[PDB]
Write an enzyme that holds these catalytic residues in place. Structure first.
Site, PDB file in Angstrom:
ATOM      1  CD  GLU A 163      -0.974  -0.892   3.751  1.00 47.87           C
ATOM      2  OE1 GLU A 163      -2.612  -1.282   3.726  1.00 47.87           O
ATOM      3  OE2 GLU A 163      -0.848  -0.200   4.922  1.00 47.87           O
ATOM      4  CD  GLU A 331      -2.562  -6.873   4.223  1.00 48.25           C
ATOM      5  OE1 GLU A 331      -3.581  -5.506   5.209  1.00 48.25           O
ATOM      6  OE2 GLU A 331      -1.901  -6.364   4.376  1.00 48.25           O
TER       7      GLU A 331
END
Ligand SMILES: [Ca+2]
Lengths: 762, 762
Positions: A163, A331
């Protein structure tokens, strides 16, 4: 073909003697894939000493872990960083690197950032940092290459970094990065400026005069021109994209499996920059996403969250549709909240497939422990309510995880279903940055508090979700008029400014037959903050100038009236709106109108419509009125508007977002049935579908197993289920027929089942 | 001995033809009292036009309402304002008053506040406001007099105004009140100054030379001296106290029932000012409180709230013990949340009696609607998930409301039990104001983010609750050393400054045998922000100077070690602590010590100990370590530390704060038994008590009713209950004996019950 249904087991935070037990337990839950990072600082503990085989520590045995996953039949998703986040020392970057090469550390505008801050921020494009990352990748990728699925190993995908967000500093305009290499004369910032603008354009955009690019200093405070601050933002994002491109090009040299990235920039609208950049550089990266809601408090996942979930799944569906790669949540929160109560967990986990995300990895699946010296965010512990705890216990949120996997693996009609709503939300990326910063320019009539008005607990988008209005998300800047015209209705939240290009396109959308809803003003400035009024002039709508309030004590409550709507509460300033037909008023002051132009229409509200809940329920009724006025009809009817329905063709997702019994009739594609949802949860209701030979007109329960002439059903939300088939039930196991009526071929049954589960035979 | 168990029914927002049905439904829930406002602006809708009988609107029939209440055998709590808050237009003050005397309106430092803001703020002490409040009281008190309990009517109590807070402005230091009358030469502020301080005193405290008192302008910004800004706050509080005294003096002329007030200043520590004031002026006012958690989102009442609940109940207990008045919560949240799930509602409602509040009113009990022109915060609706809805439906939170009521009514033993913890938290009122403003002086080494470090989700006080450490609260300034010495252990959260008097008393507390726990620093300044070190000097402890961070991204994560504590995570700066016996380290750096002085001890921690949840559970274990160091033993033992136990002598309040199954043994006063708490909830367990003739050693269920030779039990958290008695059970209604055994005259049974309720006969 295969649904990825995974859990994260970070081998380097779990005893090696426990790997096989923990993996077999994961397999017993229906998981077919293991996700793990490979942490650079774990496998290169001192400069030049690489250990992938457990020579120096049992948990350095990465080869051993991959061998075991292979032996046990798992696919592996491998995430080698170099940055892994993971609440782990420096996000995986070696302390020895930061200590011997502190010149790589990103700087604030006053100079060096403190050294004790988590994930020490690093200037990605410093050649010393990239040299070390290349040495890491050259050591780890030979192992990954040997364990690729294409080479008969388990590894099916490699993810780039984690990310990447400039080390969680992108959220602050002026925290980073002022390192000499980015800001020196003819540095990276000046080179980017040259690539993206003419020196005359920048003189115009900053309102200053420039002799060369080298005299343009990066912005340092909110007193500088907004376009300059947006340039610095998009500049830091371009440095992230150049870093991602360096990693991708290196990875490609070693692997022939798909390459992925998780939540670029930790933003959403800014994925426009990701889309344009990978298109320009022809990078075949699979965009993956994630769903986190609660940190270091009890899990809190109730109706408040639906605006955010519909928006984020919508942005994700918009981008993977354009990039044409499969959806994956790498996730899906299963840790780091104090308790994760299984019905709140279900409402999140079961809505992911409903909103287009049928490949799911659960993180963190197996709780563990941080080796001495690698602690960061948790000290020693790495087990905060993981589905499998450090001692092997199974925690309560395993239960929805199992049932959703059994559904997805047995129902290929569902994965082929599509969410195809008539309504879109029109996102405008520049607003994201202002909202993130909390920066309202002095001259703005509108608030940048989009968390309150658009996304959150009382957001407009939460209102649309709770009003039974599923919506896609479209980028106004990227979308063509032909793309906008796939939607009957587009909602747009406006601040003071909006690009000329966007307003011209919006105008053609309504001329061509589109329906717009715009609130809580119309734009008055263009992308350069210059006076400009295209939507105003085109729609023939004047909107009062009035300054939204920021001081919570000074934000008014105002009551708005509409046809059959007595005193709907709104917050902050309400603007008079002139032109077209009045649809909302505060007494005599018209504060919302509707206009027709060519084949289309626009509703303009001078107020911020928000999600409030009440007996009177005026907010949801006002949404119905805007749909009714613009001729927008839902594909379904409910006798109880508290039943949330997300249509997916041959399945209906039926949702009770509250722990409060809900009862009523559903009509969809020619069929009508009763549903009883006695608590919070989600059903996947088949409609007019063949399952294992048997033709189901509808079943008021999730089909959860396949057999020769048998269907196993789950209805954990009632002790009564209605099945309608063209055919006859010759036997029920786990229940009995309470009631039936034939109608030619149709047999309509009510089954009473003592437990959650029952099988029929036809 | 009657327990007040109340609901709010605001007659003025419910149809008059519905009043009787709604009150009968409230009677059927076991409520014996009705709360309602009388709204001035409702009964005087124009100047001089009074209507208490429903001449002009049926909901103006106050008289009929009190007749009906009386007829149905309810007590009435009456709250005639003049300010009633109530999400009602101007909080009850007439628009006609404000429009014809705008001079009464409160001013900012820049002049008049916007007129569209809610509850338009009013200079309480402006003679024209007071003249019109007195006319309101002169009209509404002759009706209240007629209907007092002493004159044969239902009215037991009168409440003054409503949680008077300068109209929800006190929370901003410089928003209010700069009206001419408070700030003119020798006006109210200059009068207060003279009365409180000798002029030279003011010059030493502010650090400026003044000629006269009338040179001192009220403070305007956070650049001016902290002690002056605290004077402005305590001065705003004194004007509220003067206002309360004028209301009280007028009320005393008409009524001979108790007089009450809710949450003065909407603060808690500031109740010190209220106590000094009613003691000084000898006002017999009953301090009442309230419990509100969630507004315009779903109700969120999980473990996260317990720090705040324990702190607020403790502040409340501290003060009613001193004023010697009965406890009451006049507003127990039953509305204004989107959904109030019954288990989360029960964890709040069932803990009030546990924490010393055995008289309870639920607000808003009966949903209604706002007549036109009286809307404010909700528009038309006044039914936001009330226990009874606009259509008469009963919502889910009625269930815990019913059973708690049955328990309080039938167990007089319980009210006479006390919470008498060995442990106290020492609150310090100057820290409340700083935390409320969010003002950190530039020089301060400590953060003023007490919501994070002390009160909220990860607060110290939440860690104490969740570690099974009930605590009282004591005010450090009002309390004597003798009163401190009633506690074996006092916990103190320290900022940079602490008064020379408190530092003296804390040193004497430890000299005389007390045990202090102080974190995350020792004070360095006195009340005038001047260097002063009595506590440090007395303990012989030096604490490192280090600046706590405010920027979220710059706040470090740090692991603390102690014996059998491997890397307990803490946030923000950690300070070296020199002197005393090391008990906590970061690497080799001692960050926590214990010293002994005279008969007692102090533990000093250079870090903010917070509430985090994990398998390794080090934060709760670190609390046990501290209690062990200082010889503090709990009154009870649990085999499973997730069983929260609040001892009350003859009763043990047993709590599962999560929707997660909890199993374990409890040992208390020489009895031991097993509990099974299958979801979130609370049991009141009786210990060695006589319940209508039956000698109960223990019972693992709430005794919810008595008869001759009978007890009805409630256990909604399992299907088995353990009961040990001196006699023999001759009959079980709603269950059967699964297991039994004698021991002399004692018999111990396991009862299986198919529902939550069963009865035994002896
Ligand atoms: Ca729940």
């Amino acid at each position: 073909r295969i649904v990825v249904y995974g859990g994260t087991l970070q081998y380097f935070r779990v005893p090696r003697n426990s790997w096989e037990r923990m993996l077999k337990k994961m397999k017993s839950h229906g998981l077919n894939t293991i996700d793990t990072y490979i942490a650079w600082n774990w496998h290169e503990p001192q400069e030049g000493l690489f250990d992938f085989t457990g020579e120096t520590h049992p948990q350095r045995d990465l080869v051993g872990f991959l061998d075991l996953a292979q032996k046990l039949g798992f696919y592996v998703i491998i995430r080698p960083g170099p940055y892994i986040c993971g609440e782990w020392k420096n996000g995986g970057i070696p302390e020895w690197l930061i200590n011997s090469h502190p010149e790589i550390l990103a700087k604030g505008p006053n100079g060096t950032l403190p050294r004790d801050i988590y994930y020490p921020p690093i200037t990605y494009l410093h050649p010393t940092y990239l040299e070390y990352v290349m040495k890491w990748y050259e050591n780890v990728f030979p192992i990954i290459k040997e364990y690729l699925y294409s080479n008969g190993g388990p590894i099916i995908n490699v993810t780039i970094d984690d990310e990447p967000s400039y080390w969680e500093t992108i959220f602050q305009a002026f925290l980073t990065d002022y390192n000499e290499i980015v800001v020196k004369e003819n540095g990276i910032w000046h080179s980017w400026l040259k690539e993206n603008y003419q020196l005359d354009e920048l003189e115009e955009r900053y309102g200053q005069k420039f002799s060369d690019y080298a005299e343009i200093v990066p912005p340092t405070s909110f007193s500088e021109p907004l376009p300059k601050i947006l340039d610095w933002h998009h500049f830091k994002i371009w440095m992230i994209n150049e870093y991602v491109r360096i990693l991708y090009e290196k990875i490609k040299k070693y692997v022939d499996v798909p390459i992925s990235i998780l939540d670029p920039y930790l933003l959403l609208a800014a994925w426009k920059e990701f889309y344009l950049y990978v298109t320009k550089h022809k990078l075949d990266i699979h965009l993956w996403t994630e769903f986190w809601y609660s940190f270091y408090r009890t899990f809190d996942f109730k109706e408040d969250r639906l605006g955010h979930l519909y928006y984020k799944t919508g942005v994700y569906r918009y981008y993977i549709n354009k990039l044409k790669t499969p959806p994956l949540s790498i996730e899906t929160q299963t840790s780091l909240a104090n308790v994760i109560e299984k019905d709140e967990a279900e409402l999140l986990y079961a809505l992911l497939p409903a909103l287009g995300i049928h490949n799911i990895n659960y993180y963190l699946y197996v709780g563990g422990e941080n080796p001495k010296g690698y602690e960061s965010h948790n000290g020693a512990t790495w087990d905060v309510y993981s589905p499998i705890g450090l001692d092997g216990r199974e925690r309560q949120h395993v239960e929805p995880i199992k049932w959703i996997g059994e559904f997805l693996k047995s129902n290929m009609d569902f994965i082929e279903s599509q969410l195809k709503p008539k309504v879109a939300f029109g996102m405008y990326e520049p607003y994201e940055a202002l909202s993130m910063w909390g920066h309202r320019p002095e001259s703005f009539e509108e608030s940048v508090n989009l968390q309150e008005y658009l996304f959150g607990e009382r957001g407009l988008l939460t209102l649309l979700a709770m009003s039974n209005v599923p919506f896609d998300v479209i980028d106004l800047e990227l979308s063509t008029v032909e793309e906008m015209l796939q939607y009957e209705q587009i909602w747009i939240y406006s601040l003071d400014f909006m690009s000329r290009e966007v307003q011209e396109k919006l105008a053609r959308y309504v001329e061509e037959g589109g329906n717009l809803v715009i609130l809580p003003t119309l734009p008055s400035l263009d992308e350069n903050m210059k006076p400009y009024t295209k939507l105003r002039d085109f729609l023939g709508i004047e909107v009062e100038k009035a300054k939204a309030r920021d001081n919570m004590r000074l934000i008014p409550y105002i009551s708005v009236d509409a046809e059959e709507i007595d005193r709907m509460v709104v917050r902050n300033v309400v603007r008079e709106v002139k032109g077209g037909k009045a649809i909302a008023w505060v007494g005599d002051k018209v504060v919302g109108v509707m206009v027709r132009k060519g084949k289309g229409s626009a509703v303009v509200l001078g107020f911020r419509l928000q999600y409030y809940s009440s007996y009177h329920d005026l907010h949801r009724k006002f949404v119905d009125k805007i749909l009714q006025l613009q001729g927008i009809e839902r594909d379904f009817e409910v006798s109880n508007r508290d039943i949330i329905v997300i249509p997916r063709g041959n399945y209906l997702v039926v949702v009770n977002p509250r722990d409060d019994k809900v009862t009523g009739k559903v009509r969809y594609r020619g069929v009508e049935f009763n549903v009883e949802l006695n608590k919070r949860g989600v059903l996947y209701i088949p409609i007019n579908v063949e399952i294992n030979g048997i033709k189901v007109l509808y079943a008021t329960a999730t089909p959860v197993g396949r057999g020769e002439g048998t269907i196993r059903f789950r209805n954990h939300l009632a002790n009564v289920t209605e099945i309608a088939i063209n055919g006859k039930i010759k036997e029920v196991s786990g229940g009995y027929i309470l009631q039936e009526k034939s109608s030619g071929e149709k047999n309509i049954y009510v089954i009473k089942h003592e437990s959650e589960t029952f099988e029929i035979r036809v």
